[PDB]
Amino acid sequence: EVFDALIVGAGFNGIYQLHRLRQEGFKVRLFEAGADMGGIWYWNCYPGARVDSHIPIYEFSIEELWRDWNWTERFPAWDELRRYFHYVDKKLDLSRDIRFGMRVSAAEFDEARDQWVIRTTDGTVVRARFFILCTGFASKPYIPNYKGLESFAGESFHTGLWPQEGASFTGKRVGVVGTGASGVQVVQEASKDAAHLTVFQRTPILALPMQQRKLDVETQQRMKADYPEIFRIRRETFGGFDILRDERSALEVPPEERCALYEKLWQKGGFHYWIGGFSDILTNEEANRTMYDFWRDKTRARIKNPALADKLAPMEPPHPFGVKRPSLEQWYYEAFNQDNVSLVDVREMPIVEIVPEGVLTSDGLVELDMLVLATGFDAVTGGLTQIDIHGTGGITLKEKWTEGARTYLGFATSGFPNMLFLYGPQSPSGFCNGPTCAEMQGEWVVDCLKHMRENNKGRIEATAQAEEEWAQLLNSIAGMTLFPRADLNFPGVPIYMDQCNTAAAKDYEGFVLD
Ligand SMILES: Cc1cc2nc3c(=O)[nH]c(=O)nc-3n(C[C@H](O)[C@H](O)[C@H](O)COP(=O)(O)OP(=O)(O)OC[C@H]3O[C@@H](n4cnc5c(N)ncnc54)[C@H](O)[C@@H]3O)c2cc1C
Ligand SMILES: [Mg+2]
């Protein structure tokens, strides 16, 4: 069973990889662990699961795809995106070369034959010259180590392991642990149904207003005259969105003018307020504060209890604004004004122990019928090192990254020839719009395989020195910004792609080709 490339993952990256490599004449197979395509949208069927990337933006720029597809709303839910991947599948004939239910579990490089020997958990083995890993950001849920967690008598699941058959909150006492992006969404749905909802917060999220909007086929057809421009523009912005920042400095502009821009951005919604402000919002602490202070007053107005507002929207920010990828929200702050909703600050009242009747903080037991763990996911290193990958260096990938992620171009790792990862560590990833990085990173991969086909090279390996230099470039770029003040994603897709494309133009410097 020999192939030019075996792709693991049937999200945007892997779907894109399968389509383009096939088009380029590579014998290719895709192994996806779940039963259907969609990536995160296969696994995340919890109530309220929605994109943070608005329409045109969170889809492929293939003309035959967006010509004949329309969305029901500006930010579609998980089930609508599954419909989008099914439509993509019919149009591009993908699934014939996908094999579902194959979880890749171990792999080993065969230097004599410059090909990978890949093993799934069902025992199937397959040779592939190239090992293209598209496992995403969210393939390893993080469940904290609370004493007695497995003891809980009611229903509990991680948001990334929501039952495929559904589950209702109606009339139940539900507790949600974590206020990440999935927590905000879960909190929104349970707040209208649950007999009581307690939310456990370590740190207040700085949730931005979504500005959701229902959509109609008519207006979308008229807009689609602008779509080719939108898809060109999104390749050229910091995070791959169609959001142009304001080039001025927040500090070099009159205050009434800052409030004007902040109000405009606030009304367009989404990541406009994250990424569309002034140029020094994420390089200058003073400028950063102007945008936090505007969000704080917006939010504190929505909340009726000042003791709550200090917890949800503190006067001092817990970190710099916009340093982590923001969560969106529709009515998340209003839910806390309800009489059936409570907010527990795990900093003040830490969780002592999980018990069958519920969650016991330092100031009492919170009896629950269902316990939702919205505690997020391991870093992208946990989803790649979850496969047992044996490199030509004598160690596993898990072992190679125990001190931290080590890559060149965010694409490869010394000791691991003919292996490339998309949306991997030290690439834009978390700071990027998925389909935008899938397309731009994707073309980089295809070009790389074509270059080796054209030049009779059967082997590529990042060098230890290029690995070292790459880390120094990340630290120097991120050292010019506030991002290291977060609790790594390469900041800047154009800066990123420019380095990648230029290494390729010098015949893949930093790699050894054989
Ligand atoms: C709820 C939620 C909403 C999000 N919304 C957005 C958004 O709006 N915009 C955005 O840019 N990003 C979003 N993200 C982050 C998201 O991970 C990336 O955006 C992106 O879409 C990742 O796409 P992907 O192709 O890289 O992989 P994913 O879509 O993450 O999928 C990876 C696939 O790999 C498969 N796989 C994993 N391990 C194995 C294995 N060992 N063997 C075989 N197969 C395996 C998995 O089953 C999974 O389907 C969101 C994440 C979550 C959790
Ligand atoms: Mg060899």
Classify 323 in phi/psi space as left (phi over 0), alpha (psi -120 to 50) or beta.
Answer: alpha
Declared resolution, Å: 2.5
* Tokens 């120097």, located at residue: 476
Sign of CA dihedral 450, 451, 456, 460: negative
Q: Angle at CA 495, nearest 5°, toward 15 and 473?
A: 110
Residues 6+ apart with CB under 8 A from 412: 419, 420, 421, 460, 461, 462, 511
What are the tokens at 238? 């910091």
Tokens of 452: 């080796």
Give the integer Cα–Cα distance in Å for 54 and 20. 25
User: What's the CA gap between 431 and 416, in Å, rounded?
Assistant: 26
Which residue type occupies 284? Answer: N
Antiparallel, parallel or unpaired: β 104-110 and 351-355: unpaired
d(CA 229, CA 361): 53
3-state SS track over 271-318:
CHHHHCCECCCCCCHHHHHHHHHHHHHHHHHHCCCHHHHHHHCCCCCC
The three-class DSSP label of residue 78 is helix
Phi, psi of 51 (to 5 degrees): -70, 160
Q: How many residues does the chain have?
A: 514
Mind listing the domains of the chain with CATH numbers? 1-143+378-514 (3.50.50.60), 144-377 (no CATH)
Beta carbons within 10 angstroms of residue 325's beta carbon? 18
Residue 122 in tokens: 């069902």
Determine the Cα–Cα distance for residues 313 and 86; give it in Å rounded to an integer: 40
**CA 299 – CA 114 distance, rounded (Å):** 57
Distance CA 69, CA 83 (A): 10
CA–CA distance from 109 to each of 383, 408, 499 (Å)? 20, 19, 28
Experimental method reported for this structure: X-ray
Q: How far apart are CA 164 and CA 157, in angstroms?
A: 11
Question: Residue 208: beta bridge partners?
Answer: 328
Beta strands in 202-244 (DSSP E): 208-209
The three-state secondary structure class of 160 is: helix
Q: CA-to-CA distance for 74 and 298, rounded, in angstroms? A: 22
For residue 120, the ligand closest to its alpha carbon is: 1
Contact between 476 and 411 (Cβ < 8 Å): no
Q: Which of 7, 18, 40, 387 to mutate to test the pocket of ligand 1 (most atoms within 8 A of CB)?
A: 40
Exposed / middle / buried, residue 73 (Cβ in 10 Å: 0-12, 13-18, 19+): middle
CB 41 within 8 A of CB 35: no
Residue 84 and residue 223 in contact, taking contact as beta carbons nearer than 8 Å: no
Max Cα distance, the chain (Å): 69
Residue 300 CA to residue 317 CA, distance in Å, equals 13
Residue of minimum CA distance from atom 35 in ligand 1? 9
How many whole angstroms separate alpha carbon 431 and alpha carbon 492? 8
What is the distance in angstroms between the CA of the first residue and the CA of the last residue of the chain?
23
Ligand 1 atom nearest residue 139's Cα: 37
- CB count, 10 Å around CB of 84? 19
Q: How open is the CA angle 432-406-33, to the nearest 5 degrees? A: 60
How many angstroms separate the CA atoms of 77 and 47, rounded?
A: 9
Unique residue bearing structure tokens 């597809």: 69
Q: Is the dihedral of CA 99, 105, 110, 116 positive or negative?
A: positive
The CA distance from 263 to 188, in Å, is 24
d(CA 472, CA 423): 20
Enumerate residues 6+ apart whose C-beta is below 8 A from 453: none
Phi, psi of 92 (to 5 degrees): -110, 0
Q: How far is the CA of 111 from the centre of ligand 2 (A)?
A: 4
Q: Measure the CA–CA gap between 306 and 439, rounded to whole angstroms.
A: 46
Residue nearest to atom 31 of ligand 1 (CA): 39
Collect contacts of 19-22 with beta carbons under 8 A, ≥24 apart: 19/92, 19/94, 20/442, 20/443, 20/446, 21/132, 21/446, 21/449, 22/97
Which of 411, 379, 381 is CA-nearest to residue 497? 411
Structure tokens at 429: 């990833």
Distance CA 223, CA 213 (A): 15
Q: Tokens at residue 164, please? A: 């495929």
CA angle, 322 then 45 then 10, to 5°: 85
63-70 long-range contacts, CB within 8 A, separation 24+: 63/228, 64/91, 65/91, 66/224, 66/227, 67/224, 70/215, 70/217, 70/220, 70/221
Testing ligand 1's pocket by substitution, the residue of 100, 102, 139, 384 carrying the most ligand atoms inside 8 A of its CB is 139
- Which ligand is located closest to the Cα atom of residue 489? 1
Dist CA 93 CA 88 (whole Å):
8
Tokens standing for residue 430: 């978390």
- Hey, what are 133's tokens? 């890993």
Q: 18: helix, coil or strand? A: helix
CA–CA separation, 475 and 484 (whole Å): 9
E strands along 307-441, which residues? 328-329, 341-345, 351-355, 358-361, 364-367, 370-373, 388-390, 419-421
Continuous segment of H or E residues that includes residue 174: strand 173-177
Ligand closest in space to the Cα of 38? 1
Q: Which atom of ligand 1 is nearest to the CA of 53?
A: 8
Are the beta carbons of 161 and 22 closer than 8 angstroms? Answer: no
Cβ atoms of residues 503 and 509 within 8 Å? yes
Residues facing residue 99 across a β-bridge? 31
Cα angle, residue 385 at apex, residues 383 and 387 outer, rounded to 5° = 90
**For strand 173-177 and strand 196-201, is the pairing parallel, antiparallel, or unpaired?**
parallel
**What region, left, alpha or beta, does residue 510 occupy, with left being phi > 0 and alpha being psi -120 to 50 degrees?**
left
Q: Is 430 in the pocket of ligand 1 (CB under 6 A)?
A: no
**How many angstroms separate the CA atoms of 217 and 245, rounded?**
30
Identify the helix (H) or strand (E) that includes residue 512.
Answer: strand 511-513
Backbone discontinuities in the chain, residue before each (C to N > 2.5 A): 487
Kindly report the number of other CB atoms within 10 A of residue 365's CB atom. 13
The residues near 255 (Cβ < 8 Å, ≥ 6 apart) are none
Q: Which of 74, 71, 75 is nearest to 50 (CA)?
A: 75
Q: How far apart are CA 287 and CA 282, in angstroms?
A: 8
Annotated binding residue at 12? Answer: yes
